[PDB]
mmCIF file of C-alpha atoms in Angstrom:
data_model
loop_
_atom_site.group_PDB
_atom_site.id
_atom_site.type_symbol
_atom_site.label_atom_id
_atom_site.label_comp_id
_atom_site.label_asym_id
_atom_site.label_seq_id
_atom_site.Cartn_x
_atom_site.Cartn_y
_atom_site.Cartn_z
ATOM 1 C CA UNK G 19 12.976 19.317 -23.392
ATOM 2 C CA UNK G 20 10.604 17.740 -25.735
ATOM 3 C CA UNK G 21 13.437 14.712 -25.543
ATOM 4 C CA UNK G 22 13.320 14.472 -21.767
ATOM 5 C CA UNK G 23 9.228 13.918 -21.970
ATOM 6 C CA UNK G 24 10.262 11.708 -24.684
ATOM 7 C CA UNK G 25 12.382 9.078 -22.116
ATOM 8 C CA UNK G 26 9.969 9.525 -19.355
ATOM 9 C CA UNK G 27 7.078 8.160 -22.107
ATOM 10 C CA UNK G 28 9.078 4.970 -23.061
ATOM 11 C CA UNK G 29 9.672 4.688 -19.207
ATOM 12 C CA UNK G 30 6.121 4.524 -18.710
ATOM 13 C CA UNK G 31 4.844 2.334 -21.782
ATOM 14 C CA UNK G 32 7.237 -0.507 -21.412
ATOM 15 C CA UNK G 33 6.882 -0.044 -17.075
ATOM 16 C CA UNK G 34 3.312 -0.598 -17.727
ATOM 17 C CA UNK G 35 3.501 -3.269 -20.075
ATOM 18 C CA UNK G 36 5.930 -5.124 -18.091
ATOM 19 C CA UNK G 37 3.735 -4.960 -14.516
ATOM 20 C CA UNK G 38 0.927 -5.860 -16.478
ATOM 21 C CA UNK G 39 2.336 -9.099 -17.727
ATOM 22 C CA UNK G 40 3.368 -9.969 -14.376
ATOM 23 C CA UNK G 41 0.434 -9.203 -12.900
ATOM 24 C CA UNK G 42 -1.071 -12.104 -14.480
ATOM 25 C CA UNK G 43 1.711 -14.241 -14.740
ATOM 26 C CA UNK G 44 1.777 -13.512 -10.831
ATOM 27 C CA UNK G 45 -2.078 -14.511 -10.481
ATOM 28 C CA UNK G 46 -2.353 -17.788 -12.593
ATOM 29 C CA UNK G 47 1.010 -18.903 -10.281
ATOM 30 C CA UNK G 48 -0.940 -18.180 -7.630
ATOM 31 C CA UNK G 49 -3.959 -20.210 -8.722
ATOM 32 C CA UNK G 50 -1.410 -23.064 -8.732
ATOM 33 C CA UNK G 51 -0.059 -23.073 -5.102
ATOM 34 C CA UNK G 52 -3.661 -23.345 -4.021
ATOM 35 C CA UNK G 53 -3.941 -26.442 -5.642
ATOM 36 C CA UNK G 54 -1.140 -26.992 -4.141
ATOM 37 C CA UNK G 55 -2.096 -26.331 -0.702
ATOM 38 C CA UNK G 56 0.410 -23.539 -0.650
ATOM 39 C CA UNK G 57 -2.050 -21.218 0.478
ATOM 40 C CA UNK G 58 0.355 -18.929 2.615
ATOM 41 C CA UNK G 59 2.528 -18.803 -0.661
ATOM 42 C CA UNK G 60 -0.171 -18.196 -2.998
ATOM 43 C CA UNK G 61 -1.062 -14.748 -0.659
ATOM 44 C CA UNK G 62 1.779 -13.729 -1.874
ATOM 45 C CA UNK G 63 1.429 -13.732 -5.580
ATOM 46 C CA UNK G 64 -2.115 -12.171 -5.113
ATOM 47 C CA UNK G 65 -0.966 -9.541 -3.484
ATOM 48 C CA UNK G 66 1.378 -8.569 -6.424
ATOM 49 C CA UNK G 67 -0.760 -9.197 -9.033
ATOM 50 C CA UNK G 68 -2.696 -6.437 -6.743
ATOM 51 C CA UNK G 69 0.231 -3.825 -6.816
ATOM 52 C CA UNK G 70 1.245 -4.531 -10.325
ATOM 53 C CA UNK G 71 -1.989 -3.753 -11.536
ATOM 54 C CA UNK G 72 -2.473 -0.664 -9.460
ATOM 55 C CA UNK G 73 0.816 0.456 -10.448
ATOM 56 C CA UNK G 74 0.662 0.042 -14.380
ATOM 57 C CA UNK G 75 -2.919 1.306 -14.442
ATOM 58 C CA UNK G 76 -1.113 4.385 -13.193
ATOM 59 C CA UNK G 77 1.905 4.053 -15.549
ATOM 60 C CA UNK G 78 -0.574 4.098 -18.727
ATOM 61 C CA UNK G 79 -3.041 7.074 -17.250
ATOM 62 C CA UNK G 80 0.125 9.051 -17.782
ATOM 63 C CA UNK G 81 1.086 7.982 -20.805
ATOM 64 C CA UNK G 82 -2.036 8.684 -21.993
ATOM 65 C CA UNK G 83 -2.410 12.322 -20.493
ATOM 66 C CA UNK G 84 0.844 12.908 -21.302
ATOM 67 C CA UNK G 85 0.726 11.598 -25.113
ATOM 68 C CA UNK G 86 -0.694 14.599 -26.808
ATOM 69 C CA UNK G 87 0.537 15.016 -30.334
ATOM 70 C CA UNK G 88 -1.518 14.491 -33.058
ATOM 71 C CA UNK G 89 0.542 11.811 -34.035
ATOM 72 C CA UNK G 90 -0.215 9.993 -30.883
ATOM 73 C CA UNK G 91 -3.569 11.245 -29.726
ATOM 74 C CA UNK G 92 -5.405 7.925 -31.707
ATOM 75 C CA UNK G 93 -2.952 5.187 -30.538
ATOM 76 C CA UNK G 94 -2.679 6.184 -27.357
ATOM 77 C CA UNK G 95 -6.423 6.137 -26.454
ATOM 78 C CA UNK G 96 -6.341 2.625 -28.468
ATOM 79 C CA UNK G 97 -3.632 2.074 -25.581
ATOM 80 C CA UNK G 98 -5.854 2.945 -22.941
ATOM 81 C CA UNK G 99 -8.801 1.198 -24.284
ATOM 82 C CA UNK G 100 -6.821 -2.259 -24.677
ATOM 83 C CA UNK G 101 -5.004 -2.074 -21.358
ATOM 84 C CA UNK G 102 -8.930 -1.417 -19.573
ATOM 85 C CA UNK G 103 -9.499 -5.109 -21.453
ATOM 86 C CA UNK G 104 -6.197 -6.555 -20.747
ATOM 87 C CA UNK G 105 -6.877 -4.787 -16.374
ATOM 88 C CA UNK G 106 -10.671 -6.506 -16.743
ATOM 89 C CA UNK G 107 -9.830 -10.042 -17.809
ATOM 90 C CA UNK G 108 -6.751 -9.778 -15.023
ATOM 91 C CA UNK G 109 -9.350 -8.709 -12.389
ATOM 92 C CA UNK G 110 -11.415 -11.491 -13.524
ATOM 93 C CA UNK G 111 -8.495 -14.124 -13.232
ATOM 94 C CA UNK G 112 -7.660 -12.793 -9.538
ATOM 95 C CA UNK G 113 -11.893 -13.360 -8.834
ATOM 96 C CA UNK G 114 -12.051 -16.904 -10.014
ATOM 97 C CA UNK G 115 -8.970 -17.761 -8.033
ATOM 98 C CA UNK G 116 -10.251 -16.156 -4.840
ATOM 99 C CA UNK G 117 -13.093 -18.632 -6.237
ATOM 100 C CA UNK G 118 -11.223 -21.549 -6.453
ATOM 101 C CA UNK G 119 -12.993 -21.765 -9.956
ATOM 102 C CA UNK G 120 -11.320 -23.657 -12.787
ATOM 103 C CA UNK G 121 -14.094 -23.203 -15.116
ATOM 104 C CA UNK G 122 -14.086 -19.002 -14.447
ATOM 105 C CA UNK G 123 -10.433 -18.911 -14.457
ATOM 106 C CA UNK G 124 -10.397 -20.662 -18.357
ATOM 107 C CA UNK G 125 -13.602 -18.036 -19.008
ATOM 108 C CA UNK G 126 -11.456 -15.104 -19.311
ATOM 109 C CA UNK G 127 -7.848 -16.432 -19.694
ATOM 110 C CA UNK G 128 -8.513 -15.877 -23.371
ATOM 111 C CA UNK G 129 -9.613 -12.293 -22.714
ATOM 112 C CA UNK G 130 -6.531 -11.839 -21.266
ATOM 113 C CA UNK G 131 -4.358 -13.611 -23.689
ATOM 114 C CA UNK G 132 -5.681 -12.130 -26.782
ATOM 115 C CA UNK G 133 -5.417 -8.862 -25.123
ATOM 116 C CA UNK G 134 -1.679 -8.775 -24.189
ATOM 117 C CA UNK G 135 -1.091 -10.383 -28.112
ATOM 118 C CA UNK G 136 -2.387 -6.216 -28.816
ATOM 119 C CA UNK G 137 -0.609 -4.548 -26.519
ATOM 120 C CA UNK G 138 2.677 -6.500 -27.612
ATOM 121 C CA UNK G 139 1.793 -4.793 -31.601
ATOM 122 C CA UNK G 140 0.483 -1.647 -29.537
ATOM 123 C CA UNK G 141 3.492 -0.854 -28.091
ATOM 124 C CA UNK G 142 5.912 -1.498 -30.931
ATOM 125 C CA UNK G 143 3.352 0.554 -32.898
ATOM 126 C CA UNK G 144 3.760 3.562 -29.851
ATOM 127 C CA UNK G 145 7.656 2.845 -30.115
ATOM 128 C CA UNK G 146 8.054 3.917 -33.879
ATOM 129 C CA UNK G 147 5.784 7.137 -33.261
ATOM 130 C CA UNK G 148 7.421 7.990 -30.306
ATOM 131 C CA UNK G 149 10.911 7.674 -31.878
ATOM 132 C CA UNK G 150 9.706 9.574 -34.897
ATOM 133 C CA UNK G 151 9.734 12.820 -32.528
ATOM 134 C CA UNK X 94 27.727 9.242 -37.730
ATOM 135 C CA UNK X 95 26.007 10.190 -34.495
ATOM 136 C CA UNK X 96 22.517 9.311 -35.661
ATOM 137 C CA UNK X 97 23.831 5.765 -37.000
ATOM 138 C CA UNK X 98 25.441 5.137 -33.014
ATOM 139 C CA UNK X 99 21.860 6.806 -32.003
ATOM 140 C CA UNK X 100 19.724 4.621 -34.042
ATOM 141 C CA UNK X 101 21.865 1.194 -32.810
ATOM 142 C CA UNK X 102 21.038 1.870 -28.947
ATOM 143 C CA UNK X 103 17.708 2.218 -29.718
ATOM 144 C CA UNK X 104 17.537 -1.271 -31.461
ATOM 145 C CA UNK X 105 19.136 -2.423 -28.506
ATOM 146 C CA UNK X 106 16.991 -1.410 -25.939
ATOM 147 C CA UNK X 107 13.821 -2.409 -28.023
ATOM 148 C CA UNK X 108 15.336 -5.755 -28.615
ATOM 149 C CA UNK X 109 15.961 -5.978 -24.565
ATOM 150 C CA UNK X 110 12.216 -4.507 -24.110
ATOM 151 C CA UNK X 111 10.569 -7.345 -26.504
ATOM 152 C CA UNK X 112 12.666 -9.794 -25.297
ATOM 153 C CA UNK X 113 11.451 -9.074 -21.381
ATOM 154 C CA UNK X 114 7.889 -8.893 -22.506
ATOM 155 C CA UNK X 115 7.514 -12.023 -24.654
ATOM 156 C CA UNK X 116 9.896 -14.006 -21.855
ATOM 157 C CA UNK X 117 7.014 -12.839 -19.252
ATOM 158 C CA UNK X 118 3.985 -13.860 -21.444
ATOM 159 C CA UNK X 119 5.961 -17.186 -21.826
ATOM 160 C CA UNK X 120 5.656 -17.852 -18.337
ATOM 161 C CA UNK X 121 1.622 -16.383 -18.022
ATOM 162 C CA UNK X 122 1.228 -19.418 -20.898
ATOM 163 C CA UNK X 123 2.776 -21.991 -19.041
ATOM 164 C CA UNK X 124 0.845 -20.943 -15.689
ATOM 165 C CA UNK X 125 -2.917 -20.416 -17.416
ATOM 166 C CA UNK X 126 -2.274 -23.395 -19.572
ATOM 167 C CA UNK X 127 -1.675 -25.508 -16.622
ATOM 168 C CA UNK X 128 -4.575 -23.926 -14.757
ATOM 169 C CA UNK X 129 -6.698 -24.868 -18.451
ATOM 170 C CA UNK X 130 -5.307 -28.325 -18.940
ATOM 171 C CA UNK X 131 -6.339 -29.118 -15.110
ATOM 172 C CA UNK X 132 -9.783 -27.797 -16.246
ATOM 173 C CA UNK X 133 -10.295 -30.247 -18.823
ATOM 174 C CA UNK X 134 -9.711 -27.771 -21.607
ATOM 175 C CA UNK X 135 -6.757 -29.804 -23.081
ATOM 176 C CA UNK X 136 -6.587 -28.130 -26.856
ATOM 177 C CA UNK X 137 -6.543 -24.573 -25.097
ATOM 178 C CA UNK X 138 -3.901 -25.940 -22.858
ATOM 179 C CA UNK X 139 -1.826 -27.493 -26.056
ATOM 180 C CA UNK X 140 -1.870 -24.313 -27.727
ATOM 181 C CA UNK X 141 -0.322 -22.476 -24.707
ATOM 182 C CA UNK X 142 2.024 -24.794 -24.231
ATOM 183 C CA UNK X 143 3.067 -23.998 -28.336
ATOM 184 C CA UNK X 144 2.783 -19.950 -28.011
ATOM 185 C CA UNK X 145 4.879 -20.527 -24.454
ATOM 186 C CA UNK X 146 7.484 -22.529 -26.705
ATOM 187 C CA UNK X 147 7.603 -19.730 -29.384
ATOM 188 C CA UNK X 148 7.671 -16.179 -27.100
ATOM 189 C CA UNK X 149 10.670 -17.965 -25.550
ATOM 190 C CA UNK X 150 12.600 -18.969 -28.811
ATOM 191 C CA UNK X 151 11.944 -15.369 -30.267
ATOM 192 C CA UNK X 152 12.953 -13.638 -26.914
ATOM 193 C CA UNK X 153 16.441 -15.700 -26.844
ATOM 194 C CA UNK X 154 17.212 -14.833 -30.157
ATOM 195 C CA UNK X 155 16.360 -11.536 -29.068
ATOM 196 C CA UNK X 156 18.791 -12.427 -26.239
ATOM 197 C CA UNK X 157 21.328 -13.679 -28.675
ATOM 198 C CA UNK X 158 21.464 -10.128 -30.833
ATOM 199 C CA UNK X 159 21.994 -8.232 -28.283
ATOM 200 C CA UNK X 160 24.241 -9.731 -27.080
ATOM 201 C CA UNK X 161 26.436 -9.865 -30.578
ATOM 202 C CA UNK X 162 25.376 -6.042 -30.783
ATOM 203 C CA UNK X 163 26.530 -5.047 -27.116
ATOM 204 C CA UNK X 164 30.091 -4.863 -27.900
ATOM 205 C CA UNK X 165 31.149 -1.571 -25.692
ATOM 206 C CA UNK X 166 33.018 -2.490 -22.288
ATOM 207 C CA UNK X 167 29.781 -0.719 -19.976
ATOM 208 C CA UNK X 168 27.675 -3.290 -21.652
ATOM 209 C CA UNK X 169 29.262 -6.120 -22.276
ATOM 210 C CA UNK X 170 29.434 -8.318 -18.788
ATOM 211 C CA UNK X 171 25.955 -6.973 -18.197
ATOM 212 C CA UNK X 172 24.745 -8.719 -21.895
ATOM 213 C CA UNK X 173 26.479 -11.371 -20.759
ATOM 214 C CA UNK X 174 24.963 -11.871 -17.521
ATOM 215 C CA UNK X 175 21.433 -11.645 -19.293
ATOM 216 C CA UNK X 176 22.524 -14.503 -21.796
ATOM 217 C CA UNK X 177 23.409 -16.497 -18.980
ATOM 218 C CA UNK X 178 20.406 -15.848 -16.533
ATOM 219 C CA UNK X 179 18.144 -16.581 -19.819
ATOM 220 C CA UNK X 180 19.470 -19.606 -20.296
ATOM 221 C CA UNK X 181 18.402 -20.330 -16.474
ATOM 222 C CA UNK X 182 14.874 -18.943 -17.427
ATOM 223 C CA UNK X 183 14.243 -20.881 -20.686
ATOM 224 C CA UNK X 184 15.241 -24.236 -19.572
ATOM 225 C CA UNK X 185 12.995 -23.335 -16.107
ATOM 226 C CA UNK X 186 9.851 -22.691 -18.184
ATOM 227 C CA UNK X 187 10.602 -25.616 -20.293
ATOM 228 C CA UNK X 188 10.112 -27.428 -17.194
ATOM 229 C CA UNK X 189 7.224 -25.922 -16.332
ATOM 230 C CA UNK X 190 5.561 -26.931 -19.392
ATOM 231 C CA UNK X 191 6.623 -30.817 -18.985
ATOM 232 C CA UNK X 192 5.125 -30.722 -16.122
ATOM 233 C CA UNK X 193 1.879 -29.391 -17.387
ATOM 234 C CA UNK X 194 2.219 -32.443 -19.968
ATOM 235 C CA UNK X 195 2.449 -34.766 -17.524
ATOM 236 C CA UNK X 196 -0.275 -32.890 -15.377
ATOM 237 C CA UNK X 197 2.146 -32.774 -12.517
ATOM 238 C CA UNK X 198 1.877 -30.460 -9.647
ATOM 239 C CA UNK X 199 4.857 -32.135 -8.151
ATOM 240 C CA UNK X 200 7.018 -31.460 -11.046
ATOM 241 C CA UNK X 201 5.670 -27.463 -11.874
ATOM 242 C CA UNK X 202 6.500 -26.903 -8.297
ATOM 243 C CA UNK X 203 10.051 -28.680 -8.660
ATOM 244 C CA UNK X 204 11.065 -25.964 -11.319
ATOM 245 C CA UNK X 205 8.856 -23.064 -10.511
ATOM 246 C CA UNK X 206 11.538 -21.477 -8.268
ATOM 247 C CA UNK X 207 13.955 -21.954 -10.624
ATOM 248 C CA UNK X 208 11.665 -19.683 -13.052
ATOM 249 C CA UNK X 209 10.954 -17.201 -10.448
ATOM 250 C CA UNK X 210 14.540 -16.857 -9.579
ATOM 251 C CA UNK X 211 15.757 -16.418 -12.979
ATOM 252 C CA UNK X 212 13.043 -13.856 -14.378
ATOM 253 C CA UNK X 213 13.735 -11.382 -10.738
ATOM 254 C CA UNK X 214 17.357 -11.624 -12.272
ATOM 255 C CA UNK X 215 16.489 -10.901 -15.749
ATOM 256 C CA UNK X 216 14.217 -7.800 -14.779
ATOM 257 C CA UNK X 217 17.219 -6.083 -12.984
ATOM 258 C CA UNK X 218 19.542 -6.932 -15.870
ATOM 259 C CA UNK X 219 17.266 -5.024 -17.893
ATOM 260 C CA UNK X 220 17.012 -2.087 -15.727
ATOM 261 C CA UNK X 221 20.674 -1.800 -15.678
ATOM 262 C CA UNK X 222 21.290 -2.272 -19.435
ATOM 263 C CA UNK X 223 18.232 0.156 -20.310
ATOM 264 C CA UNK X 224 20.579 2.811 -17.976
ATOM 265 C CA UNK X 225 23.573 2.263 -19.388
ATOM 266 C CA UNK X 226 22.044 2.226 -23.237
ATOM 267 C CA UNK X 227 20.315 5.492 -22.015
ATOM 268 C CA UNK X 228 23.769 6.995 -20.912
ATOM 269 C CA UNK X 229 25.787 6.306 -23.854
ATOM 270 C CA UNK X 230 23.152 8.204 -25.875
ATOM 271 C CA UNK X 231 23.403 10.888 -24.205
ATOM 272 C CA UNK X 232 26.908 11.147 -23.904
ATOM 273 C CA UNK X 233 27.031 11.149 -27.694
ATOM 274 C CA UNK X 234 25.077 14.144 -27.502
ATOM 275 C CA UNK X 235 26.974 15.807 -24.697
#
């Protein structure tokens, strides 16, 4: 049983991860087909970036409520706190293209960037706890 | 032993987790650098274009291990499916970054789908070879 909660973890942490990437990665593309003119297109990837950030956000609230050994209790608040950063800086890409803003979208791209850099050591930190039982 | 068998899928499946994620923040690189370099911030932009270069080259060798590692019938056309549709993602986002070189709309565009395509493939191949290294873990303990 404790095995079974173990599986639907991982499901969640790497889930998470992965939406969140693409949320962005979904976003900045976005940015780009307005400059394009592709503004139809570019509804699109906002839209996503949308979902995949509503759904991750999700994905890591359960992790977190659901990562209560004492081995985890630390790391996976650290989780929570670094995904909020990584979710802000996302949110902030999404307003500067709604903005059409170069200048805000370069403002918290580095946010963002050094953000996901932590989860990536986050996660293979949560990965060798979690597999320790 | 069991454990040994145990401990090899999960290597697997972490190398196929890592190697998703970093192919991902390869692309976010390529697309925010672009967005950077068209801002006028052209050392940011250079240094995504790098970090883009080196999430890809440590995700295919990523790639590459598994691949060597995924011996077992169940897994081994799906691994080899993966290599394949990398491939089609690496040389996509290599693109991508000419383009933002060049600063060239025209030519992001002209490989973009290409990217797009290949990454919806690689996140299914994933799915599937996550499964199937889940299910021959737990038939080991069945």
């Amino acid at each position: 049983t404790e095995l079974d909660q173990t599986a639907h973890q991982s499901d969640r942490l790497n889930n998470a991860l992965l939406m969140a990437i693409r949320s962005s990665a979904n976003v900045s593309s976005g940015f780009i087909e307005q400059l394009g003119g592709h503004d139809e297109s570019a509804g699109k990837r906002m839209a996503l970036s949308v979902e995949l950030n509503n759904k991750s956000q999700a994905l890591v609230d359960e992790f977190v409520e659901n990562a209560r050994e004492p081995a985890l209790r630390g790391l996976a608040t650290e989780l929570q706190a670094t995904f909020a950063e990584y979710a802000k800086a996302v949110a902030g890409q999404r307003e500067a293209t709604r903005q059409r803003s170069l200048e805000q979208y370069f403002k918290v791209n580095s946010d963002a960037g050094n953000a996901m850099g932590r989860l990536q050591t986050l996660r293979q930190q949560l990965v060798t706890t979690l597999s320790e039982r």
